[PDB]
Design an enzyme around this catalytic site. Structure first.
Site, PDB file in Angstrom:
ATOM      1  N   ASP A  35       5.116 -15.902   0.291  1.00  0.00           N
ATOM      2  CA  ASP A  35       3.769 -15.688  -0.249  1.00  0.00           C
ATOM      3  C   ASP A  35       3.090 -14.553   0.503  1.00  0.00           C
ATOM      4  OD1 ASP A  35       1.309 -15.845  -1.339  1.00  0.00           O
ATOM      5  OD2 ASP A  35       0.759 -17.781  -0.418  1.00  0.00           O
ATOM      6  N   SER A 199      -5.176   0.304  -7.436  1.00  0.00           N
ATOM      7  CA  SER A 199      -4.486   0.903  -8.573  1.00  0.00           C
ATOM      8  C   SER A 199      -5.332   2.008  -9.190  1.00  0.00           C
ATOM      9  CB  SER A 199      -4.127  -0.177  -9.586  1.00  0.00           C
ATOM     10  OG  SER A 199      -3.651   0.313 -10.774  1.00  0.00           O
TER      11      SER A 199
HETATM   12  C1  LIG Z   1       3.594 -23.083  -5.670  1.00  0.00           C
HETATM   13  C2  LIG Z   1       2.210 -22.658  -5.268  1.00  0.00           C
HETATM   14  C3  LIG Z   1       2.006 -21.410  -4.679  1.00  0.00           C
HETATM   15  C4  LIG Z   1       0.762 -21.027  -4.218  1.00  0.00           C
HETATM   16  C5  LIG Z   1      -0.310 -21.884  -4.354  1.00  0.00           C
HETATM   17  C6  LIG Z   1      -0.142 -23.109  -4.974  1.00  0.00           C
HETATM   18  C7  LIG Z   1       1.110 -23.513  -5.432  1.00  0.00           C
HETATM   19  C8  LIG Z   1       1.275 -24.854  -6.112  1.00  0.00           C
HETATM   20  C9  LIG Z   1       1.215 -24.752  -7.649  1.00  0.00           C
HETATM   21  N1  LIG Z   1       2.337 -25.029  -8.291  1.00  0.00           N
HETATM   22  O1  LIG Z   1       0.173 -24.431  -8.227  1.00  0.00           O
END
Ligand SMILES: Cc1ccccc1CC(N)=O
Ligand code: NA
Length: 330
Positions: A35, A199
Site C-alpha cells: 500500500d 498530473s
Molecule cells: C484491502 C483494503 C485496502 C486498504 C484499505 C481497506 C481495505 C479493506 C477493504 N477490502 O475495503
C-alpha cells in the site's frame, strides 16, 4: 541488494493485489497488500481476536526465533474506506522477493474491522508511503522500504500491476524490459506523507486532451481512480445511461456499454487507461448495472490515482533525497 516479488489479484475484478512476504525464523509467509498510501506493516496474528479471523494466515511471533516484543509500542490505523486495525509491535526479519530487512517493525493486530475479517485473501498490509505516517507510538517506526533503502542498489521500488493478471513489485532496480518507450519523472511532495504529484491533464476516449493540474497521490492500496467531479462527469457523460447513484455510492453504467478509455498526463507524456480497466462489474450478483472504476474524489479531500490508473503504467517510486515518481507505458 534488490528484491523482486510477484503481486496477484485477490479476485476477478482486481479489487486488490497480494504479495507473499516472509516474516520471522523459520519463515512464516503471509500474503500482504502493498500500500503506497500508508506506512504501517501490520499482520493478522496469534494475538488477533479469534472472532475477527476468518481464513487469514496469521503471524505467530512466539514461533519465530528472531521476533522481539517492541516493549510499550502500540499502533492504531484507520483507512479511507472506514476500515481499521490496531495492536502491539514486534521486531523481526522480513523478506520480500529475496530482499531482507532485519529489525523491521511488524505490527501485530489485536483488533481488525469487519472489512478485514471478511477478506480471507489479505493477511495484512505493507505500507510504502513515507515513514512520517507510521502510527506506532510512542516511537514511530520505519517502513520496509525506508529500512531497506541504504542496502539497495538504487533507492527505488517499482509497481507493475496487472490487469486481471499478476504483476511485479521490484526493489532497488528498474527493469528496463518491463515498459515501452521512456519513463517520465515528475515531482513529488512529501508534505502529507504520500507519493503526491500533479498530473498535467486528461482526455476521455479519442477526445481532445484538457491541460489542467490535478494534484493527487499514487496509491496501490486503493482500487479505483478518484478524480475531481468535473473530470469524472466529463468521463461518464460519454457512456449512454451512466449516472451517479447515491443508493450505490457512485457512478454506475449499463453492463451492455462499451467504456471509453481515459488518458492522464504525466508532464508531456500520456498514460492511457483502456475502457475495460474501468469496468468493475455488476453492482450485485446478476444485476445489469455495473460499477464504474472512475469515481469522484469530492467526498475524500484528495485525488487518488489508485490501481485502475497505476495498472496502466510501469510506476517508479524514487526514494532518493528528493523523491520523484516515474511513469512509463507498458
Ligand atoms: C484491502 C483494503 C485496502 C486498504 C484499505 C481497506 C481495505 C479493506 C477493504 N477490502 O475495503
Ligand atoms: Na465497491
Amino acid at each position: 541488494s534488490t528484491g523482486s516479488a510477484t503481486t496477484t489479484p485477490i479476485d476477478s475484478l482486481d479489487d486488490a493485489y497480494i504479495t507473499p512476504v516472509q516474516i520471522g525464523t523459520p519463515a512464516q509467509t503471509l500474503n500482504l497488500d502493498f500500500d503506497t498510501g500508508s506506512s504501517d506493516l501490520w499482520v493478522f496474528s496469534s494475538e488477533t481476536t479469534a472472532s475477527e479471523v476468518d481464513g487469514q494466515t496469521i503471524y505467530t511471533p512466539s514461533k519465530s526465533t528472531t521476533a522481539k516484543l517492541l516493549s510499550g509500542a502500540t499502533w492504531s490505523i484507520s483507512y479511507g474506506d472506514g476500515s481499521s486495525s490496531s495492536g502491539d509491535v514486534y521486531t523481526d526479519t522480513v523478506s520480500v522477493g529475496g530482499l531482507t530487512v532485519t529489525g523491521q517493525a511488524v505490527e501485530s493486530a489485536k483488533k481488525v474491522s469487519s472489512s478485514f475479517t471478511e477478506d480471507s485473501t489479505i493477511d495484512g498490509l505493507l505500507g510504502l508511503a513515507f515513514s512520517t505516517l507510521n502510527t506506532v507510538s510512542p516511537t514511530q517506526q520505519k517502513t520496509f522500504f525506508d529500512n531497506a533503502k541504504a542496502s539497495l542498489d538504487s533507492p527505488v521500488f517499482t509497481a507493475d500491476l496487472g490487469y486481471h493478471a499478476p504483476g511485479t513489485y521490484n526493489f532497488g532496480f528498474i527493469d528496463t524490459t518491463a515498459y515501452t518507450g521512456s519513463i517520465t519523472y515528475t515531482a513529488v511532495s512529501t508534505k502529507q506523507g504520500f507519493w503526491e504529484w500533479t498530473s498535467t491533464g486528461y482526455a476521455v476516449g479519442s477526445g481532445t486532451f484538457k491541460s489542467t493540474s490535478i494534484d493527487g497521490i499514487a496509491d496501490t492500496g486503493t482500487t479505483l481512480l478518484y478524480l475531481p467531479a468535473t473530470v469524472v462527469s466529463a468521463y461518464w457523460a460519454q457512456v449512454s445511461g451512466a449516472k451517479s447513484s447515491s443508493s450505490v455510492g457512485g457512478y454506475v453504467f449499463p453492463c451492455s456499454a462499451t467504456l471509453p478509455s481515459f488518458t492522464f498526463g504525466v508532464g508531456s507524456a500520456r498514460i492511457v487507461i483502456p475502457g475495460d480497466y474501468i469496468d468493475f462489474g455488476p453492482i450485485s450478483t446478476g444485476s445489469s448495472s455495473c460499477f464504474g472504476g472512475i469515481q469522484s474524489s469530492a467526498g475524500i479531500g484528495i485525488n487518488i490515482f489508485g490501481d485502475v490508473a497505476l495498472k496502466a503504467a510501469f510506476v517508479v517510486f524514487n526514494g532518493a533525497t528528493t523523491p520523484t515518481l516515474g511513469f512509463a507505458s507498458k
